[PDB]
Amino acid sequence: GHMKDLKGTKTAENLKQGFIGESMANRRYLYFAKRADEEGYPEIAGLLRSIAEGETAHAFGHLDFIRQGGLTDPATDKPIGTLEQMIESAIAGETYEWTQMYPGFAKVAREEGFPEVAEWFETLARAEKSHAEKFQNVLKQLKGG
Amino acid sequence: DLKGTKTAENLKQGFIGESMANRRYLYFAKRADEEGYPEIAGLLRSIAEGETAHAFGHLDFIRQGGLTDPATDKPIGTLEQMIESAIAGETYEWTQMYPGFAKVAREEGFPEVAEWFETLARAEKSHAEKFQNVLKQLKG
Ligand SMILES: [Cl-]
Ligand SMILES: [Co+2]
Ligand SMILES: [Co+2]
Ligand SMILES: [Co+2]
Ligand SMILES: [Co+2]
Ligand SMILES: [Co+2]
């Protein structure tokens, strides 16, 4: 019963929302752990890091149900059944970010008078272009053998 | 002041995207691992570290600008505030979000998915309690 079709269901949408929240929880808790680290709270830092592993398990399980239910990647709306498809999903999202999202964010940051945040968004646009090209070169290797 | 700007929203959306990218690439790496593509797995893992740096830098600008946590809309300036943000999100998840998802899954005919969401509700309740015990240790 693991392969029941989830397309068009509310449950499909709920898996995507769960994946988003679990992804953020891991990042948040590892960021908070660094504050605990600096201040000298190793037990708190360690708890944050261990709970973060929990949120990894939660996120990965949501992606298993997404993949098995015939759903697409929460970030890109691309299929992620095969390794080739996974890499194509990575390329699609990186391409969105370097062609559109980060340059757009930089332009708006400059307009609103946040040049330091704009510089950061421009760095990230260049970074996601580098990422897209490296994934493009790997895909070429996969599809060539 | 970043509060109420479009740049504040774009930092929040950047954080969301970057958080998902790290999770996605580490998940994809496991498939590369199984199939015998260590260079592809390694690349996914190294790029994933890039996306960690991106997400953390978004949180730096958020925290420095006095903006709230993307996940909870709670302040994250101090360690105590960070633990309070963790508690608020976990409490929403176990009291509302996961039980609600479970009910919808059951009602749509997906018992296995519902069981998963009920597991996660219990897990987030355990997380919340462990964070509440941390906050007691700090605030006291
Ligand atoms: Cl401690
Ligand atoms: Co089955
Ligand atoms: Co979780
Ligand atoms: Co990237
Ligand atoms: Co990134
Ligand atoms: Co949790």
UniProtKB/TrEMBL annotation, chain B:
Q: Where does Fe(3+) 3 bind?
A: E51, E90, E124, H127
Q: Does the keyword Cell inner membrane apply?
A: no
The signal sequence is none
Residues that, per the record, bind Fe(3+) 1: E18, E51, H54, E124
Q: Which CDD domains match?
A: Rubrerythrin
What sequence ranges are listed for the domain Ferritin-like diiron?
1-140
Per its UniProt entry, which superkingdom is the organism in? Archaea
> Which amino acids does the record list as binding Zn(2+)?
E51, E90, E124, H127
Residues binding Mn(2+) 2 are: E51, E90, E124, H127
The protein's UniProt keywords, in alphabetical order, are: Metal-binding, Zinc
Pfam families annotated for this entry? Rubrerythrin
> A single GO molecular function, which one?
oxidoreductase activity
PANTHER family referenced in this protein's UniProt entry, alphabetically: RUBRERYTHRIN
Q: What is the official name of this protein in its record? A: Sulerythrin
Organism name: Sulfurisphaera tokodaii (strain DSM 16993 / JCM 10545 / NBRC 100140 / 7) (Sulfolobus tokodaii)
